[PDB]
């Protein structure tokens, strides 16, 4: 269906993912979480199971940070979207921060190990970065843009 194809093509364009396989992964997880949201709406208000599960889940979701902290309602948790999920995706945070010139640029940085979250290097550009961890995204100390050695091509023309 053309709506499905144009939709997924638009998504990979605005966030240069690798494939519809990755896209459908994000979609299947959205389906789980919105399904849990729907069954929590199937429970009624002041039911303690609903209260505990709802506050726990919204806490999880604002803790990963994909939900805005302004709104804390299960209706908006059900109104969540994959645009916010791929905004949460690691590489897109890199491109939004401006360590790279393009989204594919940032994905290449995450592949060949230039950026770190806080302490450690991460090779995968689809890492779930939390709201608490969005700050400490910087170059490696081993990266030439961070320091250490000048780099391979720098070495070879300096030779």
């Amino acid at each position: 269906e053309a709506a499905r194809l144009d939709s997924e093509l638009k998504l990979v364009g605005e966030y240069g993912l690798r494939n519809k396989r990755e896209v459908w992964r994000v979609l299947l997880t959205l389906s789980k979480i919105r399904r849990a949201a729907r069954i929590l709406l199937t429970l009624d208000e002041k039911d303690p199971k609903r209260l505990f599960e709802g506050n726990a889940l919204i806490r999880r979701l604002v803790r990963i940070g994909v939900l805005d902290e302004s709104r804390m309602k299960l209706d908006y948790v059900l109104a969540l979207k994959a645009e916010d999920f791929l905004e949460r995706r690691l590489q897109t945070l890199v491109y939004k921060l401006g360590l790279a010139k393009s989204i594919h640029h940032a994905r290449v940085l995450i592949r060949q190990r230039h950026i770190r979250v806080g302490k450690q290097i991460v090779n995968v550009p689809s890492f779930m970065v939390r709201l608490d961890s969005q700050k400490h995204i910087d170059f490696a100390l081993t990266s030439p843009f961070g320091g250490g050695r000048p780099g391979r091509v720098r070495r070879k023309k300096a030779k």
Partner: protein, 120 residues
């Protein structure tokens, strides 16, 4: 004259919070001339003007073009605190944070502009 003055209860602090966020996200123009040029180019999402400024006609002439463009402008009572909340080493009296099509800072701007819209 500065009747769209902001009040104490954490409103001002939310302003400074989003100000620092915009200084980090590089979606912020700063100082009276650059604020002027941003609202002239209409790109500004919202504009914040100090109130403790030596004579206030600067942050009085800015709301003229804010009233032309119809952009939310708001009065904050400490320009040195604006300087600190932007990270300047200099006190700033006029700041203008613009809009982009892809950010959650944009949602923060939406909430903040709704609050100042209820304010004025």
């Amino acid at each position: 004259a500065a009747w769209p003055k902001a009040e104490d209860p954490a409103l001002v602090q939310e302003l400074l919070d989003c100000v620092q966020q915009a200084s980090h996200y590089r979606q912020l123009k700063k100082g009276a001339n650059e604020t002027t040029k941003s609202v002239n180019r209409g790109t500004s999402e919202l504009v914040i003007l100090a109130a403790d400024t030596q004579p206030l006609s600067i942050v009085l002439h800015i709301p003229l073009i804010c009233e032309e463009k119809n952009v939310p402008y708001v009065y904050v009572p400490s320009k040195v605190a604006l300087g600190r909340a932007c990270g300047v080493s200099r006190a700033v009296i006029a700041v203008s944070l613009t809009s982009n099509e892809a950010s959650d800072l944009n949602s923060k701007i939406r909430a903040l502009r709704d609050k100042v819209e209820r304010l004025a």
